Amino acid sequence: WTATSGSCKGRCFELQEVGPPDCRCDNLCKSYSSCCHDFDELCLKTARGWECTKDRCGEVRNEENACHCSEDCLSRGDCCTNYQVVCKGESHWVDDDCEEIKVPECPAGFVRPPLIIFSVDGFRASYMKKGSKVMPNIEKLRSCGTHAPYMRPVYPTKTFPNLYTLATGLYPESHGIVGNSMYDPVFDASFHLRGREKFNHRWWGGQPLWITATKQGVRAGTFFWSVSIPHERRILTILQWLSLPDNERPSVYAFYSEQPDFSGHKYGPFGPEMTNPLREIDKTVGQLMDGLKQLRLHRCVNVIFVGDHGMEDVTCDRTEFLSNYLTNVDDITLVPGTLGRIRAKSINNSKYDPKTIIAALTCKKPDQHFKPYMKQHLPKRLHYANNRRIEDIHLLVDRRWHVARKPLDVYKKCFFQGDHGFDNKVNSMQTVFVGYGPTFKYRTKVPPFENIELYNVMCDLLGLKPAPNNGTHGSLNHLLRTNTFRPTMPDEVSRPNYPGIMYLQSEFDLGCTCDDKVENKLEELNKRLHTKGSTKERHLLYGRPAVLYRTSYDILYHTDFESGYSEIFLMPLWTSYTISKQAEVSSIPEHLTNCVRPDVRVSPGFSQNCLAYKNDKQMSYGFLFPPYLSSSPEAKYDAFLVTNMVPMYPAFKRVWAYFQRVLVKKYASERNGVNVISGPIFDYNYDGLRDTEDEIKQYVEGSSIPVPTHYYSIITSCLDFTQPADKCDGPLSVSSFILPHRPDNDESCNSSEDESKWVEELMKMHTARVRDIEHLTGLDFYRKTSRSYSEILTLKTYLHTYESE
Ligand SMILES: *[C@@H]1O[C@H](CO)[C@@H](O[C@@H]2O[C@H](CO)[C@@H](O[C@@H]3O[C@H](CO[C@H]4O[C@H](CO)[C@@H](O)[C@H](O[C@H]5O[C@H](CO)[C@@H](O)[C@H](O)[C@@H]5O[C@H]5O[C@H](CO)[C@@H](O)[C@H](O)[C@@H]5O)[C@@H]4O)[C@@H](O)[C@H](O[C@H]4O[C@H](CO)[C@@H](O)[C@H](O)[C@@H]4O[C@H]4O[C@H](CO)[C@@H](O)[C@H](O)[C@@H]4O)[C@@H]3O)[C@H](O)[C@H]2NC(C)=O)[C@H](O)[C@H]1NC(C)=O
Ligand SMILES: O=S(=O)(C1COC1)N1Cc2cnc(N[C@@H]3Cc4ccc(Cl)cc4C3)nc2C1
Ligand SMILES: [Ca+2]
Ligand SMILES: [Ca+2]
C-alpha cells in the first residue's frame, strides 16, 4: 500500500529511496507503482521536446518545458544538451578534435573525477566496426580513449547475471543471479523478469559498486531506471545531479539503454532495422558529452561505455524439444531457451532419476544441437555450479539454437530472430568496453578481458577498496594512466623438502615391476647432477610454483622434468618440463609397458602402489611427464618413477596419451618450444577451489590414493615466436586447460573415431585461465620472470578461446 497523495515537489529523482507507505519520486518509483500522484507532471516534463532552437535562445524561463534555453539554464544545470551549440555558437563535442586528457580539469569543489557508466543492453562487440559510420560519438570515445576489441561476458550471457557481475566483480554462482529466471529451493521462491519477487534483496548477493561507494563515503547516483523514463530524461537527470552542491553531488553514475537488445531480439543482430537503434544510442552519447562540455566536465569525468552481452541469430525453427528424447517429459521442469536447466517437476516423485535423463539426452541424433551435463562436469571456465539455484542437469545449447520441453511451448507463447545466453566464449556473445577520461589512457588498444575484472577498475577510478571478488586486481592496470593497483605476490605458505637418496629398493613392497636391471664414472656423475637439479633452469623457466596452503611436499629433480611431489596426496601437485621445437617423440618400449619404479628419494609410506591399480577394475594410471618426450633412452627410466604416476580412467588415458604423444610436440613445433606444467585437480564440491583432504570422495580401491576430478596443463612460450621458449627476452604466450577426469568419453559424441577427430575439440571446450588453475590447486605460477607483476596478472587471466576472428 502507497499513500500516493504525497508530492514530488522539490524531490524529482531523489537519491534516498523513502519508506512505504510514503510515496516515492526516485528513478525506480514507476517499477514499484509507488510514485507520488504528481511525479509525471513535475519529474517527466516533455513540453517542447529535448533540443533548443534559435527562437528559444534567451527565452523567459518556463518551468513546464522539458529542458531550458533561458540565460539562467547553465547555473540551474537544466539547459537542453544542445543549448551552447544553438544559442552560443559552440561546437558539438563530436566535432572537436581528440586532445589527450593528462589530468582531470574539474570545476572547483570536485574532490575526485566522477565516473559515468554508460551501459548498453545487447551491444555486440562487432557493432563497433560494422556500425561505425552511424555512431560518430561512440567512435570518438573508442578511438580517443582506451578500448578493447571485445569484452567477454559471464555465462549465462543474459542481462541480469551480466549487469550484476559488472556491479560486483563476482561470478553468477557467487552473486546468486544465475539466470534471468531462477528457483531457489531454500526460499521455495521463483525469480522472474516480470513480477515483484526480483525486488527482494535476498536474491542479490555480494556487494555492488553503489554499496561499496556509499560504505566508503562516496555518494552514488541510483543505477536502475524504470523503462518508461525516456533516455533524454535519464541524461538530463545525470547532468542535473552533476550540478548539485559539493556535499550532495554523487561521484558515480549509471545510464542504461534497453537498446540495442530490444530490437536485436525482433530483427536479429544485423537486421536492417538495427541501424536506427544504433543511431539513437549514438545520439544519446552525443547528448551526454555535449551536456558535460556545457558544464565544463568533458575533461573531468571518466566515461565507461560497456555492454552486458552480444546477440546471435536464433529463430523458432531452430528449437530442439526434449519431448523428442524423454519418455517422461511431464515429470520435469525445464528452464528453457539458449541454455537448459532441468529439475524434477515434484520432489515427491521418488522415480525421478537424473542418470536416466542424462542418458536419454546423450548423443541421440547425429546433429543434436545441445549437450547434457551434470553441472559439476561443465567446463570449469564457466564457473557455473556452486549455487543451489543452478539445477544439477544443464544443457549447453549450440549457438543459433533453443531448447524447449514440448513444441506447444514455442507457439502457445514466428516472432523473434535474435537471442543470447550461450557459452561466453561464442563470438556473437562478446560485448564492448571503452574507457575515456583523465584516468584512462589515450588512443590505446588493450587486449580483450572478462567483465568480472571491471568492478576492481571502477573501485580504482573512485579510490574505493573493492569487496572480495573474482577479478584479479592489477590485471587491468594497463587500461589506466594513474590509480594503478600495485599488489605484492602472495607469500609462499609451505616450503619444499629437497630429499636425496634415502631408501633401498627392497624397502618398497608396492607390487610394481620394471625390467630396468641394466648397469660408468662419466655418466654416473651426470645422473647424480641431474638428480641434484643441474637441468632445472631448462625445465622450470618461471621459478617453482609457490604453495599457498599448509602441506608437506618434496621437490624432485630429473634430467627432463622437475616436480613438486605431495606426501599427503601421494602424487605431484605440479610437473614442469620444456620441449624444444627440435624435440624427438619416441615410444614406450615394449620391455617398459608395465614398468613402475620405486623412487629411492621418497618413503614407501608416501608412495602409490601398483597392487591398488591391479585390484581397482575401473582405474588405471598415467604419467605426468610423458615417457614419449624423454631426451634419451636412459633418461626415459625417470618417467616411470612411482612419483610421476597419477590415477587415470582408461577413457581419460585415451585423451592424455594423445595429448602427450602428439599434441605437445605439435605445440612445440608451432610455438618454437613450449614449457608445460601439468598436474591434478581435486574439486569434489564444484566450488572452483582446491579441495582439502577431507573433501575427497573417491580413492583408488583399497588405498589412500585420491582420485583427481580434473587434470590441468599450462603451456607457455615466447609471444615473439622467433625466440625459443627457453631463451625468451620479452612477453609470454600461454594456453591452458582443465580436462574433466571422467570414466567414459560420453561428452565426445565422436569418441569411437581416431583421437585426431575429437581430442582437440574436447581440450578447446575445456580451455582455462592460469588463474582458474591457481584457484583449483592453491599454487601461484610465474613467480620468477623478468616481467612486471601486472603484466603477469594479465597473462594469468588470458583465455585461449579458439574462435576465428
Ligand atoms: C569468487 O569470489 C568470491 C568472493 O571472494 C569467493 O566467494 C567466497 O568464498 C569463500 C569460500 O567458499 C566464502 O567463505 C565462506 O563464508 C561464510 C560466511 O558467508 C556469509 O558472509 C559473507 C560476507 O558478507 C557473504 O559474502 C556470504 O554471501 C554468500 O552467501 C549468501 C547465501 O545466503 C548469498 O546471498 C551470496 O550470494 C553468497 O553466496 C555464495 O557463497 C556461498 C558460501 O558462503 C555459497 O554457498 C553460495 O552458493 C554462493 O556461491 C554469506 O552471507 C562462512 O560461514 C564459511 O565458513 C565455513 O567454512 C570454513 C572453511 O574454511 C570453515 O573453516 C568454517 O569453520 C566454516 O565452517 C562452518 O560452516 C560450514 C558450512 O556451513 C560447515 O560445514 C562447518 O561444519 C562449520 O559449521 C566460508 O568462509 C565466502 O562467503 C564467499 N563469498 C561470496 C560473496 O560468494 C569465491 O570463492 C570466488 N570464486 C573463485 C572460483 O575463486
Ligand atoms: O529488466 S531489464 O533487464 C531489461 C529492460 O528490459 C530487459 N533491466 C531494466 C534496467 C534498468 N536499469 C538498469 N541499469 C543498469 C544496471 C547496472 C549494473 C551495472 C552497471 Cl556497471 C551499470 C548498470 C546500469 N538496468 C536494467 C536492466
Ligand atoms: Ca542484456
Ligand atoms: Ca573444492
Ligand SMILES: [K+]
Ligand atoms: K585397474
Ligand code: NA
Ligand atoms: Na563418446
Ligand SMILES: [Zn+2]
Ligand atoms: Zn536480450
